[PDB]
């Protein structure tokens, strides 16, 4: 792993997930003059805590992904987006749920997902019709599909 | 004045302006056993303070009107709309300036003025074209002429 993905393309949560199968817990032993095991940072309590936290994160992510899928369908955007839109939704949500992974920061993650999907749809439409000076339809009002707020949807 | 203007149509600032020449000060006497002038509410500082404050109001109103006129000209609104711009502007600003007079609240006064002017122009255009069924243009974007802000431009 440490040789395949350098610092340039190493998402935090994917590395944390891949690490949870490589920690010895308490079955480690360090070679010295006599085999001795250090019992301060090698135990199963760390493993239990990490696994519980990751399970909670995964459940919350599943729920928010379901909600985002419902919104994506209801807002009538599937008419663009290549041949299959579900893979695009999944990719553009996972590329955000792996960086901003805290619990009290749902707004930033969901906004990242929504704006990514909108930008991709609009870019695909421009690439299909044949450039930016042949669009007779209206596009500037398309940003009104994000849910409304006071300090978010005004700027 | 107090007879030809009921409570339902009595602007505060107009009443103050018409009452600023009906309060003598020291040139008054109150009937008793002997003609005696009361001093606590009949003074001369009252007139000076009132005149200074009212002249400050005059100057602030002049400056704000001279700015709003430039805004109404540069925004290209006389093309479609009222039959005479100056009277409509003067009236629609005098209303706000005669209702909200305090000096640390120019924002609400200017906002009232701008929104009233925009609404009047749009209503005149709708009435001229023959109802809202034949209005080909797009009118939601016409609210972008109001200067942008961070928290006062979504609602």
UniProtKB/Swiss-Prot annotation, chains A, B:
Any phenotype upon disruption?
Answer: No visible phenotype under normal growth conditions. Mutant plants exhibit increased susceptibility to the rice blast fungus Magnaporthe grisea, and reduced capacity to inhibit germination and growth of lowland weeds in paddy soil, possibly due to decreased levels of momilactones and oryzalexin S.
Q: Kindly list the places in or outside the cell where this protein is found, as annotated in its UniProt entry.
A: Plastid, Chloroplast
Q: What inducers act on this gene?
A: Induced by UV irradiation. Induced by methyl jasmonate.
Q: What else is known?
A: Phytoalexins are diterpenoid secondary metabolites involved in the defense mechanism of the plant and produced in response to attack (by a pathogen, elicitor or UV irradiation).
Record's function text? Catalyzes the conversion of geranylgeranyl diphosphate to the phytoalexin precursor syn-copalyl diphosphate. Required for the biosynthesis of momilactones that exude from roots and act as allelochemicals against lowland weeds in paddy soil.
- Any notes on this protein's domains? The Asp-Xaa-Asp-Asp (DXDD) motif is important for the catalytic activity, presumably through binding to Mg(2+).
Family indicated by similarity: Belongs to the terpene synthase family.
- What is the protein's name according to its record? Syn-copalyl diphosphate synthase, chloroplastic
* Organism of provenance: Oryza sativa subsp. japonica (Rice)
